[PDB]
Amino acid sequence: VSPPPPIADEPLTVNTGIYLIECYSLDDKAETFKVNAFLSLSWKDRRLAFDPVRSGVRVKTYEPEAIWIPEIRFVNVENARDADVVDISVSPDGTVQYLERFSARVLSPLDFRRYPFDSQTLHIYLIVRSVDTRNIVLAVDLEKVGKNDDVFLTGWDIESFTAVVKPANFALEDRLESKLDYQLRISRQYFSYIPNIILPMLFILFISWTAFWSTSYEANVTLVVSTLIAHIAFNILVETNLPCTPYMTYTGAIIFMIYLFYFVAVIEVTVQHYLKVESQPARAASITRASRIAFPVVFLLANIILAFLFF
């Protein structure tokens, strides 16, 4: 067929409802995620209307090819969704109740400023282009919106799955387009990051600082340079599970700032030795004793300065 004709001159309202069955594969570098969910559609098509008393059955099942169904599409998806139609029910007044189960790969940008303490807002944009004959608007049936209790996103906590009830209606290539915003709110599980990356990164740094309670250049150079190399291993490791951000990330700042604490430790160590060869173990030991406090203090100051700038 073709669209149901207006029963006045009114835009056709299509009622939507996404129900998350599964959430999986949140790819941080690609800024994508996969979803498996129910998509529930509902519209009024009077042409399909009937009498429950006459036909003796209060609901009518239909195969999708048989009736007019709106061309609903996802906006922020890599390829068109994979969908199997579950049910089509028509109530006496001509109300269609569409239900399909779909799966799709979704493009939603992530903000890494507060990584790995960051929280995200994933989006699923539902859309419909209107026909010449008829204008189409989307609406949210809040009863058919949700997620099941099990959905689990490896590595994240799931706060809420809600929808912006008012659609964004606009012209696109001389036709009306109705766009809905479904929002999945998530928070990163950062427990593992503390013993697996953060504390080791600090231990290797604190080991570099033992060159302040040592008079031997040879051993000091080894202490600082070897631990600096270990810090590079961690800088490379963490920047690889991350995309090319045009903004300073929080961990990125910490790591970068640490590169200076190794550089300045090399300066101190280079100085302490230079004075011993010039025969002033006098000020060499003053500098070495100063560094012992200066470094832990400046480090702790800087980390507070940064945490304040980012949280």
Ligand X SMILES: CCCCCCCCCCCC(=O)OC[C@H](COP(=O)(O)OCC[N+](C)(C)C)OC(=O)CCCCCCCCCCC
Q: Which of 24, 68, 152, 213 binds ligand X (CB under 6 A)?
A: 213
Kindly state the smallest distance separating residue 153's Cβ from ligand X, in Å: 17
Q: How far is C-alpha 144 from the chain's CA centre?
A: 24
Residue 214, SS3?
coil
Compare residues 44 and 127 and give the one whose CB is closer to its own copies.
Answer: 127
Please choose which of Na ion, its own copies, Cl ion, none residue 176 contacts, taking the beta carbon within 5 to 8 angstroms, the exact cut-off set by kind. Cl ion
Q: Which of 7, 8, 171, 244 binds its own copies (CB under 8 A)?
A: 244
Q: Is 261 in the site for ligand X (CB under 6 A)?
A: no
Q: Is 112 in the site for Cl ion (CB under 5 A)?
A: no
Kindly state the smallest distance separating residue 69's Cβ from Na ion, in Å: 4
- DSSP code per residue over 85-116: EEEEEEETTTEEEEEEEEEEEEE-----TTTT
Q: Which of 133, 189, 210, 222 binds ligand X (CB under 6 A)?
A: 210
Compare residues 55 and 241 and give the one whose CB is closer to ligand X.
Answer: 241
310 close to 251: Cβ distance less than 8 angstroms? no
Which residues touch 189 (CB under 8 Å, ≥6 apart)? Answer: 155, 156, 157
Kindly state the smallest distance separating residue 107's Cβ from Cl ion, in Å: 12
Name the helix (H) or strand (E) containing 169: strand 156-171
Could you tell me which of 177, 224, 198 has the C-alpha nearest to residue 75?
A: 177
- Please, which of residues 159-178 interact with Cl ion by CB under 5 A? 170-171, 175-176
- Please, which of residues 225-264 interact with Na ion by CB under 5 A? none
Distance CA 309, CA 199 (A): 22
Assign 3-class secondary structure to 24-59: EEEECCCCEEEEEEEEEEEEECHHHCCCHHHHCCCC
Please choose which of its own copies, Cl ion, ligand X, none residue 300 contacts, taking the beta carbon within 5 to 8 angstroms, the exact cut-off set by kind. none
Name the H helices within the chain.
Answer: 52-55, 193, 199-208, 217-240, 250-277, 281-310
Which residues touch 293 (CB under 8 Å, ≥6 apart)? Answer: none
Q: Which of 139, 158, 164, 207 binds its own copies (CB under 8 A)?
A: 207
- Please, which of residues 58-117 interact with its own copies by CB under 8 A? 58-59, 61, 71, 73, 75-80, 82, 84, 86-87, 89, 99, 101, 103, 107, 109
Site string for its own copies, 4-33 (x = CB under 8 A): -------------x-x-xx-xx---xxxx-
Compare residues 228 and 254 and give the one whose CB is closer to ligand X.
Answer: 254
Could you tell me which of 169, 144, 172, 147 has the C-alpha nearest to residue 160?
A: 147
Q: Determine the angle formed by the axes of helices 250-277 and 199-208, rounding to 10 degrees.
A: 10
Site string for Na ion, 13-52 (x = CB under 5 A): ----------------------------------------
Name the helix (H) or strand (E) containing 168: strand 156-171
Task: State the number of binding residues for ligand X (CB under 6 A).
Answer: 19
Site string for Cl ion, 44-83 (x = CB under 5 A): -----------------------------xx-----xx--
Q: Is 299 in the site for its own copies (CB under 8 A)?
A: no
Residues that bind Cl ion (CB under 5 A): 73-74, 80-81, 170-171, 175-176
Interacting residues with Na ion (CB under 5 A): 64, 69, 222
